[PDB]
Amino acid sequence: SDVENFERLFSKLKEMKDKAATLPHEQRKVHAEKVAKAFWMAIGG
Amino acid sequence: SDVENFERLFSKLKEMKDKAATLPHEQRKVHAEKVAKAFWMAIG
Amino acid sequence: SDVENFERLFSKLKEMKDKAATLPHEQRKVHAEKVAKAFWMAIGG
Amino acid sequence: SDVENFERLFSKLKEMKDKAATLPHEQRKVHAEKVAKAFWMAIG
Numbered sequence: 001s002d003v004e005n006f007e008r009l010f011s012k013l014k015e016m017k018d019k020a021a022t023l024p025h026e027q028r029k030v031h032a033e034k035v036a037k038a039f040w041m042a043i044g045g
Numbered sequence: 046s047d048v049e050n051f052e053r054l055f056s057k058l059k060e061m062k063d064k065a066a067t068l069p070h071e072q073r074k075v076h077a078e079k080v081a082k083a084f085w086m087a088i089g
Numbered sequence: 090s091d092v093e094n095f096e097r098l099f100s101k102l103k104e105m106k107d108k109a110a111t112l113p114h115e116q117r118k119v120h121a122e123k124v125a126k127a128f129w130m131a132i133g134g
Numbered sequence: 135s136d137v138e139n140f141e142r143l144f145s146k147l148k149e150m151k152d153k154a155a156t157l158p159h160e161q162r163k164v165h166a167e168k169v170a171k172a173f174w175m176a177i178g
Contacts, residue, residue, distance in 0.1 A: 020082035109171035125153035
């Protein structure tokens with residue numbers, strides 16, 4: 001029904017809000033992994 | 046200790062290998078989170 | 090395999106460590122050779 | 135002894151010639167060792 005659909009979509013919006021809050025931590029993790037890949041290639045990995 | 050240094054460096058090589066291997070997956074997560082943020086900011 | 094690759098890369102890190110330990114002796118040798126080149130040019134070599 | 139002095143000075147000229155000629159190669163070794171040290175310190 002429309003109520004269950006709205007409840008599910010609010011849950012989806014909360015999911016999107018939480019993903020957005022994760023973004024700065026995720027971007028720092030990506031930078032650290034880029035550094036690791038550069039070192040990994042440099043030593044001949 | 047010789048063996049302890051190898052133990053430490055082996056795990057640091059493994060950690061560096063794992064970070065490097067996870068980079069494409071993490072880049073896809075960052076993109077998906079950016080899409081989620083843009084839609085959340087526009088809607089909410 | 091991944092084990093042989095890790096073993097080879099540890100060997101590479103030990104190579105880099107040994108090169109780093111050689112650096113002070115190498116810099117003293119470079120200074121002595123710079124002195125020698127200055128004298129060599131001075132006497133018309 | 136006249137010949138002994140020439141023997142000594144000839145080899146000192148040769149040693150000085152050899153040091154001077156090795157300078158560019160040794161400078162490249164120093165640079166490579168500095169690169170190895172920077173990466174070893176950052177990783178290990």
